[PDB]
């Protein structure tokens, strides 16, 4: 089985900015046997090139590939909006045709720090026996942020979960969830629920609490 | 063009028959699961029937396909949660084709729409709404919890209210049920004036809730 490595597994750049993709393949293609596909949210994968270095029909002319043997790339002249989007490569020139895991192509902006808000359960909520309380990170660039609870300045683990947006499509930003839940029972045994955050546009760590 | 049928949400042991409707050409069936790569299941070339599978499905797929309403077939069998997946059928080209015996590979396209594909022991449950009250921006939001399965829709004053929205994707708990948050930020001095209102629905459980939402 030919494996396919896909690198950077992020590129983040501007508009307007030359993007090269890599896909290399642990055994030597057979003879240009190559295929890239771009995929948005949503939507199926979309053939650009194929024999390595052939555009397909309807594709932009900043779309070219090349490459042979273990050593392939991808590259987008000069990035347009539509061009964010996931790559993948394939190689079909052995059985079984194989595909590389996707380099994502991102939005680079302007760094942004989160607004942090909490919210504690409902009155709804606690009737039916459950807690949840949520912490918003809103409206930021980069990605990496880190989101830690305390319970009475006690560190909690285990017992949240995260979500995240895709880049907006307006300013490009990011926004993150994360999600507390404690039995009704747990959630009365404490006064203090506070969300910290830690992101590279903070000075320092921002934490957002409330007494219950 | 290819034309895929809807999404199916099975247990797991059951089986699922998804179809390829052309509007040739070897039909490739690829999946991709939640956040994940592509996976090639198999093919058929759908004028003489000749099969072909990879390793890991040999035993509980079959592929088949009807000339005569030029639509293909994809069977998986002895599901498990791990086989939820968008599942796409594609045509594989016939230019430069690469042949290996009776198996045929080459670049893929046009691509079907793809067909959302969930296996869960979980039953049909409507979402509970709960309100996540404001406490010189406000943010506000509807906690949209323990639903199945996907998807539900969220929108804030019928539709009216867009600027400034996020609607997170679904996570999955472990006991099987999906929740999500919609949030929006909106000026402070807005929060005694102004009504907002999220209107949730899920249509597996003939869910429809609008919930202010006020401080």
């Not at chain 1, 002319?61 to 539509?82: A, H």
């Not at chain 1, 990496?144 to 909690?156: I, P």
């Not at chain 2, 000339?67 to 997946?85: K, M, Q």
């Amino acid at each position: 089985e030919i494996e396919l490595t896909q690198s950077p597994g992020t590129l983040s750049l501007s508009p307007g900015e030359r993007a090269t993709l890599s896909c290399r393949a642990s055994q030597s293609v057979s003879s240009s046997y190559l295929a890239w596909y771009q995929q948005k949210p949503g939507q199926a994968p979309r053939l650009l090139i194929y024999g390595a270095s052939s555009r397909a029909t309807g594709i932009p002319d900043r779309f070219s590939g090349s490459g042979s043997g273990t050593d392939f790339t991808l590259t987008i002249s000069r990035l347009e909006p539509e061009d964010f989007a996931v790559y993948y490569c394939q190689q079909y020139g052995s059985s079984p045709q194989t595909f590389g895991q996707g380099t994502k192509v991102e939005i680079k902006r302007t760094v942004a720090a989160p607004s942090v808000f909490i919210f504690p359960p409902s009155d709804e909520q606690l009737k039916s026996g459950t807690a949840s309380v949520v912490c918003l990170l809103n409206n930021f660039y980069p990605r990496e942020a880190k989101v830690q609870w305390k319970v009475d300045n006690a560190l909690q683990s285990g017992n949240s979960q995260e979500s995240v947006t895709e880049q907006d499509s307006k300013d490009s930003t990011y926004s993150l969830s994360s999600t507390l839940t404690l039995s009704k029972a747990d959630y009365e045994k404490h006064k203090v629920y506070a969300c910290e955050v830690t992101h590279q546009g903070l000075s320092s760590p921002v934490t957002k609490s409330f007494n219950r | 063009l290819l034309e895929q049928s809807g999404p199916e949400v099975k247990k797991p042991g059951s089986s699922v028959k998804v179809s390829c409707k052309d509007s040739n050409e070897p039909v490739t069936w690829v999946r991709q699961a939640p956040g994940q790569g592509l996976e090639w299941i198999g093919g058929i070339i759908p004028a003489f029937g000749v099969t072909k599978y990879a390793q890991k499905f040999q035993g509980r797929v079959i592929i088949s396909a009807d000339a005569s309403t030029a639509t293909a077939y994809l069977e998986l069998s002895s599901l498990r949660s791990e086989d939820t997946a968008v599942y796409y059928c594609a045509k594989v080209g016939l230019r430069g084709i690469v042949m290996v015996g009776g198996l045929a590979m080459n670049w893929l396209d046009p691509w079907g729409q793809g067909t959302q594909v969930t296996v869960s022991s979980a039953s049909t449950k409507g979402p509970s709404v709960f309100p996540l009250a404001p406490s010189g921006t406000a943010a506000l939001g509807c906690l949209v919890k323990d639903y199945f399965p996907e998807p539900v829709t969220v929108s804030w004053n019928s539709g009216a209210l867009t600027s400034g929205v996020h609607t997170f994707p679904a996570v999955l708990q472990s006991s099987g049920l999906y929740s999500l948050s919609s949030v929006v930020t909106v000026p402070s001095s807005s929060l005694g004036t102004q009504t907002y209102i999220c209107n949730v629905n899920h249509k597996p459980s003939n869910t429809k809730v609008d919930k202010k939402v006020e401080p």
